[PDB]
Amino acid sequence: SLTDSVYERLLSERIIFLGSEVNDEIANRLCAQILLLAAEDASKDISLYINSPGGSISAGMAIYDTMVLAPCDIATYAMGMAASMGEFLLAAGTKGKRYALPHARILMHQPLGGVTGSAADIAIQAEQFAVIKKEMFRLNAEFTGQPIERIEADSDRDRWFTAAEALEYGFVDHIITR
Amino acid sequence: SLTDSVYERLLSERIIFLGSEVNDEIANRLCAQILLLAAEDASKDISLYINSPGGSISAGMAIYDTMVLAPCDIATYAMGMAASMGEFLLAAGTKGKRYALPHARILMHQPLGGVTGSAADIAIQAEQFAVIKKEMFRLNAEFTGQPIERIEADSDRDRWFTAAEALEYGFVDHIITR
Amino acid sequence: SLTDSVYERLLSERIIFLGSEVNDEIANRLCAQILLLAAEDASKDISLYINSPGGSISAGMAIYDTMVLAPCDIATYAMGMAASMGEFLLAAGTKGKRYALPHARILMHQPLGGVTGSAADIAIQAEQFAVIKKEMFRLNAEFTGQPIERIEADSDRDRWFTAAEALEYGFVDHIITR
Amino acid sequence: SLTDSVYERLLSERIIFLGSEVNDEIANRLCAQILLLAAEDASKDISLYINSPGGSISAGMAIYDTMVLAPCDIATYAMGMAASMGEFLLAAGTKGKRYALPHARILMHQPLGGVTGSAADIAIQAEQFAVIKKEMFRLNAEFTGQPIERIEADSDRDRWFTAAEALEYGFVDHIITR
Amino acid sequence: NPYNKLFEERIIFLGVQVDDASANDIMAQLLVLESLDPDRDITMYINSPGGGFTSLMAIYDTMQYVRADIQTVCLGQAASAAAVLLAAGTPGKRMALPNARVLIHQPSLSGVIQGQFSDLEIQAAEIERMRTLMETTLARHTGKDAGVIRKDTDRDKILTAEEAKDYGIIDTVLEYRKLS
Amino acid sequence: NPYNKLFEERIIFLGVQVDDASANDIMAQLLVLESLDPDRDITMYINSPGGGFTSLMAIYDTMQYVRADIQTVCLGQAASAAAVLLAAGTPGKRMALPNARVLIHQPSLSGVIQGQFSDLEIQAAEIERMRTLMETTLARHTGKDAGVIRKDTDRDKILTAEEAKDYGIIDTVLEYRKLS
Amino acid sequence: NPYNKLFEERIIFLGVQVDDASANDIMAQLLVLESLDPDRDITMYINSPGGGFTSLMAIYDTMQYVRADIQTVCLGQAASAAAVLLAAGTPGKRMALPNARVLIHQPSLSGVIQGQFSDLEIQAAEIERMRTLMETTLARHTGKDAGVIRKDTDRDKILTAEEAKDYGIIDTVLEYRKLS
Amino acid sequence: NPYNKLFEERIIFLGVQVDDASANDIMAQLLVLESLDPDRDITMYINSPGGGFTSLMAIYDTMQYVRADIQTVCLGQAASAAAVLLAAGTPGKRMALPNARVLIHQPSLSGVIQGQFSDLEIQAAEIERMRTLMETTLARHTGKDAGVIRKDTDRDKILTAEEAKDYGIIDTVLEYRKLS
Amino acid sequence: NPYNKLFEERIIFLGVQVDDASANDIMAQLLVLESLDPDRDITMYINSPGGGFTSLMAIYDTMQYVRADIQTVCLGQAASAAAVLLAAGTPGKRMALPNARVLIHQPSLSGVIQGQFSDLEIQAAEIERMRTLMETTLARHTGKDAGVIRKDTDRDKILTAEEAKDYGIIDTVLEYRKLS
Ligand SMILES: CC(C)C[C@H](NC(=O)[C@H](Cc1ccccc1)NC(=O)c1cnccn1)B(O)O
Ligand SMILES: CC(C)C[C@H](NC(=O)[C@H](Cc1ccccc1)NC(=O)c1cnccn1)B(O)O
Ligand SMILES: CC(C)C[C@H](NC(=O)[C@H](Cc1ccccc1)NC(=O)c1cnccn1)B(O)O
Ligand SMILES: CC(C)C[C@H](NC(=O)[C@H](Cc1ccccc1)NC(=O)c1cnccn1)B(O)O
Ligand SMILES: CC(C)C[C@H](NC(=O)[C@H](Cc1ccccc1)NC(=O)c1cnccn1)B(O)O
Ligand SMILES: CC(C)C[C@H](NC(=O)[C@H](Cc1ccccc1)NC(=O)c1cnccn1)B(O)O
Ligand SMILES: CC(C)C[C@H](NC(=O)[C@H](Cc1ccccc1)NC(=O)c1cnccn1)B(O)O
Ligand SMILES: CC(C)C[C@H](NC(=O)[C@H](Cc1ccccc1)NC(=O)c1cnccn1)B(O)O
Numbered sequence A, B, C, D: 001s002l003t004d005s006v007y008e009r010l011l012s013e014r015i016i017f018l019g020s021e022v023n024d025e026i027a028n029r030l031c032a033q034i035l036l037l038a039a040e041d042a043s044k045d046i047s048l049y050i051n052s053p054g055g056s057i058s059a060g061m062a063i064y065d066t067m068v069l070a071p072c073d074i075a076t077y078a079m080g081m082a083a084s085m086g087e088f089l090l091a092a093g094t095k096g097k098r099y100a101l102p103h104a105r106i107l108m109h110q111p112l113g114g115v116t117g118s119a120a121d122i123a124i125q126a127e128q129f130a131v132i133k134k135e136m137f138r139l140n141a142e143f144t145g146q147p148i149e150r151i152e153a154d155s156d157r158d159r160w161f162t163a164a165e166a167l168e169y170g171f172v173d174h175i176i177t178r
Numbered sequence E, F, G, H, I: 001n002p003y004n005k006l007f008e009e010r011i012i013f014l015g016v017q018v019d020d021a022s023a024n025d026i027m028a029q030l031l032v033l034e035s036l037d038p039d040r041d042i043t044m045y046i047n048s049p050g051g052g053f054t055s056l057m058a059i060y061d062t063m064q065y066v067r068a069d070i071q072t073v074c075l076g077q078a079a080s081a082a083a084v085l086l087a088a089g090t091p092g093k094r095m096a097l098p099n100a101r102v103l104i105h106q107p108s109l110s111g112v113i114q115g116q117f118s119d120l121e122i123q124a125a126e127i128e129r130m131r132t133l134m135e136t137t138l139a140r141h142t143g144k145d146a147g148v149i150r151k152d153t154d155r156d157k158i159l160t161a162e163e164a165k166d167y168g169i170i171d172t173v174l175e176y177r178k179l180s
């Protein structure tokens, strides 16, 4: 395909794309792209451009752990939409290299999920939803440099950001003005 | 495809991916990848990165037997999610080489299934569910180095683990902190 | 595809896979792979690794006849699941070369089917179901080295086997303990 | 695909496959394969292995006419299932070169169809069903060397054959016992 | 209920598709009105697209079996089985209101009847027998030859009320009797 | 039931889509009220989007056949077949309340009628006959030429109550008789 | 209701597909009319495509169990189970109106019954027992040998009313008793 | 209604699939007839393919709880739960008409019950308890050992009326009492 | 109607799935019978798979609110909410017929309730409150500790009638009172 070819040629330029809903399929695709680019050169930065409506936490945590444990810096680029998990992976970039394009939008909100099964199953799901929520908020606290109480109050429903608002909140470090 | 190409280039670097629900299709894909990499070099380790919500026991037992009977060590990597069968195959790695990325989540629970047909069919299914449950718990006991009574009590419903909790429980041997 | 490429590279190493439900599509794929490998070298063994939930009798009989009439030996490998027709094709391997991986499961049961149409159509289907059942049981008797009366009593419903139980019953000849 | 590649490599060895329900799509595929192999060498035999549940008469008559008008002999191979049209095309092979693998099953029955539309349309369909039935029975009479009255009585419902029963009836000429 | 009031005045609607549920409703209404009075005329107002041949001949035989004369009046359409039931009325008592259409055509199988060719030969000999029986039924009621019915019902022959009178399906184009 | 109370006051609703089930309900109600009293006017309140042509002409003929005069009053819409049934009332007794719309258009086949071209030639000669019969029916009831109806019903011609009075579909835009 | 009026005149419709809901309706109507008067004839008008074998033999046994004679008259069709129920009437009292068809055929499973071959061997021994029981039932009621029924019901054998009389399924082709 | 007339003659139909809606209908009818007269026999005509085990044992217990004797007569089929309810009648009062079939088989789960293996172990211990309870219920009513019921109901065992009498499910193959 | 006859004898069926429509039917029947006579016992025959917790506690409170004693008898099954309603009867007046099963289990959400984790924390605190309230309700009615109910209803605990008597869900395994 052409669309796979253009992504392949920017993979050669160490530019990868979180360009859809982060499910397990494209997370393992992005994790493999980060591992492949860290195997090629451990020094040159990986540009992760993020046009993402969010998605699975563990799929995004797979990308986040692959971003951190890569020895090269992951420059993240809010391109249009960095919502939910794509917001997270945007703010998960290397400090100083988290970039928002000027009309990208950043959506930070508490994680979505579902409860099902028996009451003992749901109580375990609730305990794990409280663990996922706390780790999503602690890492967003670590990314933005803001307290977890502010992250918890702001993510309680959908909190939208412009590139300038995400700059002052701490998701990104610069706004690209070429 | 690009996603098949990036997995192919890390297959050259002996990095394979349990990146979806382990059904028979990707288990035979992973078993063939372990056989192919053991045929190339029987000494260099295979890195199995696991972003998996679990799946079929016999598909995972196919991967597990292919992991053990490969003469090379299978380094397993909890990447985001190692749940159910993906938890099992994570803990099924070579001892000392079972790794959890720091924000990966490990879900250990008793196997899921279904009963159907006549009462004599279901009684055979129940006997085989008791055999599958005992072998899933004995091998998780062998992996984690913990008693089968603790594995049976903890897997009775969904038991979630962080990377640190899976480290102290015995699913993994280290947490990657590059 | 990568999954077709890894199966192609083990086809070069004479390793083929009964890795799904044996329908007519992958049986003709496996029959063509046995014919192609017998055309390359009539002396080196074909490794048939079987992760199969069973399937069509005539599709499996197509594989079975292609296995026998190949001049080279068909080493069969129970990998995770050898059920129904995949059990049959496992036990259909060359004697001494039928292998079970230690946590593979072997399911032997009488064939499944359906009756439909008029009573004269169903009576013909029943006569042919009795012919298929007798030939499936006689060949399982020939494979396992056990009487057809024991095969008929044991296959009456689902009879599950471990690798050790399939070893003593006669489906496989060894358990791989590398 | 690999499955297209393995069929391509046996197409180089003049081995083609009636491996599904004979509809117009794979009949034109098989007719083109017979024309291509007769264009390569008009002397070497084409091996048509048949694992087929039957199908369209005119699609099978397309294959049958392509088999006869090919100057090279069409060796037919009952592999698992030769039912209906696949039975027909099995018995349509060159005399002396119609082979049944020993556990292949041969199903001979009168053609299936449907009546629809007005009574004058159905009366034309019935006249053409009587022409198709007579030509299917006359050619099965010519193939098996048995009278059309025996073909008509035996095909009235589903008549199943083993490889030995299809040998004595006349669908095949030998049973492969390598 | 105006259906029950007309039934007490010995008036029956063939107003739906002629299937077995509709046929049983007509046959019950015909046999009650025969048992009420076998001498008074039953009026069968027919507004129907037709339907199944068995339910046709169930109504057809019951119309001919009952001692009461059946006044068939077509209203809107008497198509297929309903055209035959329109022609099945008592001679001299078959009407159609002037803008009712009468569609005659050969029988047809709805959808596809699958099966072996021996089964299909029987289904085709049956739909040919259904074709011949319809044409013979339309022969004795329209006064035309059954071969004339066969050529005319080879495809859809929609008649007006006047054209169905000339064809013999009805006997009188029923004039409007409005007082103004 | 207010439907039954108005029926006892000789008031009928054409209030649904004109299909064969609706047509049989109207024709039963028209023929009961003819048998109750053939001299008193039947009032047919019409709120309908129209429907099938056969069920149109089933109601049309029955409106013209019964001895009682049919007062058609349009309420809301008299579209397609229902506009023809609105025009089918007794002359001088066809009303529409002032904000009722009257949609006249040529007949149409709902969906696609498949078939051989000989069958389609007959289906097209029939829908042309249905077109000509509708225009002839609207000719004698609106006082306009059938070629004028053909040019006007070539597409949807929605009339108001006043415009349907000038067209001849109704005879009186029915004034509001509220006492306050 | 004309169904209830005919039921008071001891007339039952087998007018739908013979399933368990239809069978329970027939058996309740047969056992009430037995309890009303066991000496008067029950008339069973049959317009049915047949149906399930159990609901067949539920009606069959109940027709034979009740003290009243069962007059089976076929109207339109008696196919499958309904042909057997038509033949199941009291001898001398089995009728068919002249254009009723009678379809006899061997039993069949609707759709595909899945299962293990041991289960399918039992389902096939049952449908063979259902085949043999139908042919034995049609043997004692038509006067023909059960092997003759087996060759004739091997596929669909549609009989006319005259052909079902010669076959023994009915006893009299019921003449039209219309007075005109 | 012939259902209500037979209910006044203390006759109940188990005529549908034995589910909770059917069970509540039977239990209401059994407990009304117990309250009407506890000494007269309740007749339970059974034409049923069976159904749920709970609705089986709901009807089973209610048949055994009421003071009135339950005359179970099988008509057509008494399959699964319905065969057990047929055997659940009062001893000496369990009938089957001669061409009724009686299908006994072990209980089964319809479809697939998903869940964890601890949940499935309980669902399997329950369907084994349902299997053992059915065989124990069929033991005390047929006079056979529960291990004999287990070997016989391992797959479908269809009995005729004579074979269900020898098995002990009914007590009398109910002879046809037709006067002619 | 046998439902209405038993209702006049103060007998109520909990015979369907316990949802809000079923709960409103029970609560209306409980409050009418309280208003008819608050001193006579209401009998609640329970054949139910359970259902919603709100409709459970709607019936539960209404059973406890009415002045009349509630005789709960289990017939076939009392599963989930229905087991709690079975235990919700008046002490000494809770029965089960001997082959009725009693399934107790913790509450469950049918399907998946989507939402934000703050919404899911509330839905989980509610299903935990529903779990605790069910166990507290089963504590005061079975005489067992609520922690014993929690360990026993952790998965499906199917009791027989005898096992539900020992557990405290019923008070008497209701003996069969058949006279023969
Ligand atoms: C990243 C967080 C904070 C916000 C949203 N992400 C989630 O919460 C996602 C949305 C999602 C995606 C795929 C499948 C199911 C659910 N939730 C989860 O992945 C999830 C939910 N519950 C437990 C564990 N993980 B985003 O996708 O809108
Ligand atoms: C690995 C175990 C402990 C946990 C879960 N795995 C299972 O139990 C899986 C889930 C599954 C996957 C595909 C199809 C059907 C069922 N269960 C099985 O494979 C299974 C169930 N019953 C008998 C034999 N195998 B995991 O997928 O959540
Ligand atoms: C191999 C035997 C002993 C066991 C099972 N195999 C069968 O019996 C298979 C299952 C199946 C697969 C595809 C389509 C239809 C049916 N049955 C058949 O192929 C079959 C059934 N009846 C007549 C002829 N063949 B296995 O698939 O569970
Ligand atoms: C070859 C004959 C003798 C037996 C069967 N073949 C047919 O009769 C096939 C089955 C089929 C396949 C595809 C589409 C429609 C029908 N029948 C026809 O092709 C057919 C039917 N009626 C008229 C002309 N051709 B076989 O497919 O079971
Ligand atoms: C032409 C007259 C006699 C009747 C017309 N159609 C038929 O003959 C009907 C059309 C129809 C209706 C309902 C269901 C199935 C088929 N044909 C039959 O009933 C029929 C039934 N069995 C075999 C053959 N034809 B009418 O309905 O268009
Ligand atoms: C224009 C007037 C006469 C009627 C309008 N439509 C028609 O003429 C209707 C539209 C319709 C309604 C229901 C089902 C199928 C088709 N045409 C017909 O009924 C019709 C029927 N057979 C052949 C050709 N047209 B109205 O319903 O829009
Ligand atoms: C031939 C006579 C006896 C009856 C004909 N068909 C049958 O025998 C019926 C056809 C049918 C009807 C409804 C649902 C399922 C199957 N066969 C059966 O009822 C049946 C039931 N169980 C096993 C085997 N056959 B008739 O309905 O065409
Ligand atoms: C064998 C006798 C006792 C009853 C037969 N089947 C059963 O036992 C029934 C079959 C059925 C019916 C409706 C819905 C679900 C399952 N089994 C049950 O009711 C059932 C219910 N819960 C757990 C286990 N089995 B019969 O219906 O074929």
Ligand SMILES: CC(C)C[C@H](NC(=O)[C@H](Cc1ccccc1)NC(=O)c1cnccn1)B(O)O
Residues within 6 Å of the ligand: I049, I050, I051, I052, I053, I054, I056, I079, I080, I081, I084, I105, I106, I107, I108, I109, I110, I126, I127, I130, I134
């Ligand atoms: C355990 C007893 C108390 C009740 C059982 N189940 C429940 O608790 C029911 C199951 C159910 C039924 C219908 C619709 C949705 C959910 N749970 C609830 O009603 C429910 C409602 N809102 C929140 C949480 N649970 B029973 O129905 O299996």
